[model samples]
Target: KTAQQLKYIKDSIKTIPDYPKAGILFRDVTSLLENPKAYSASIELLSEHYSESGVTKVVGTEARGFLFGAPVALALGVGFVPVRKPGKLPRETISESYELEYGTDTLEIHTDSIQPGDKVLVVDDLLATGGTIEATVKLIRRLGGEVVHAAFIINLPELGGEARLTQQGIHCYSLVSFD
Candidate 1:
């Protein structure tokens, strides 16, 4: 049933050719959200995977991460933490900057969000270059939280995000993969 469920979840995803640019195939999960069963399966799979990992919190990136992260947090009976762009968080925040294809981007989290003993599970929509999630992991560590794992719905293996995180001793988990 797990294999069949994963296949159904993968099939429910939508892929658009040359979406944003020529030669870039965008894997969109909006279609997956449209299918209630597949969507439920996705959360179940993610939540179940870490249900016994002693995760004290689920940290998700701004916007997209909140979608899957919040649901998984609830499913695991843990709190949800959000890492957002600068000025979005209304508290004392620590920020991390990362290089992007063009320029650079910054991410911020409240200083008090994660406790020293907290075990965090980072959640995001996709794993591409690992820059964003890498920065997110830094934020968690800065607040004394231990990042147990990084979870995504879709992984673009060719992009090397999983490889990057794994090299840092961080495990990456995803429901589906595309070249």
Candidate 2:
């Protein structure tokens, strides 16, 4: 991604203080989505990162990731896979769980969504502690899909999520990062 494009995306995002809790600054992307250029640039930048990665399928989490992954999949000429919550998918599914601050959560994918040696790219909006993304990775592997990479629009460095995913040898790419 170009530095200017990154700056445009960063600038388009709205920051709210003490949101969802006190003493926390939340970097929100709603504003970025509201703007036409920034929204397109963000996706184009992320898709460009994996243009040569041989990605056969693009995987996304529940809702937000759905927004980014669908168009990226189209841009790459690949199919889109939605990893949904339990009972959300119509077909037979395989599930994987991951940690939460309080408990655990599960994400499921269709049993035949992907096959062995299928190169997959995972996309999400944020990488915060990576619990959800880790579960998505597990779901991908269980279906014999090869995880080529995980791409995010934002990364909270202080949350340390990216580090954990990196430790698992899954390369992560983000357009914007906050400390």
Candidate 3:
């Protein structure tokens, strides 16, 4: 039923060339959010896939992830956890650091967010390098939560972010793909 609505979800996204730098194209989903039906379908698509997957919590990345993850969490009736930068989270936190083109950056998760036996689903807008998602998975595991899957709005297949996660034994789902 909802499978047919994917076209609506995909079409609403906008592409901007040379975003952040030359020779780079950015897939923006804010355009999708601008269309009410597309945005709802996006959430419905994600919610439908994980509804019966035994997801105990939904972990969304720093900024964009929160947009989808929170609403999906509500739909699934599960808790939502925020994976943020260094000092954004309050209370005791566990951190995971990842390498970037120039240097390294870190992400933090509340130490008490996940308990033993948690089945977590990581959410973000795009899967480019899988760096952030991998670090997020580590944080969940450190806190005794299991990362079940990672979902994204768009995937840059040429970047091989999905394959990188697969090599690490993490499953990924994406709504649209752009090479």
Please list all clashing residue pairs in model 3, or write none if there are none.
Answer: none
TM-score of each: 0.98, 0.97, 0.97
lDDT of 2 by residue, 1-179 (tens): 48888999999988899997998888888898899999999889989999998899999997989988888998999999999989999988999988788988899999898999999999999888998888889889988989959999999978988899988779999999987
Which run of 10 residues does model 3 get worst, by summed lDDT? 1-10
Best of the two (1, 2) by TM-score:
1
Top-scoring candidate (lDDT): 1
By summed lDDT, which 10 consecutive residues of candidate 1 come out lowest?
160-169
Candidate no. 2 TM-score: 0.97
What global local distance difference test value does model 2 have?
0.90
Task: List the candidate numbers ranked by lDDT, top first.
Answer: 1, 2, 3
True-vs-predicted CA distance for residue 115, candidate 3, Å: 1.1
Full-model lDDT for every candidate: 0.93, 0.90, 0.90
Cα deviation of 11, candidate 3, in Å: 0.7
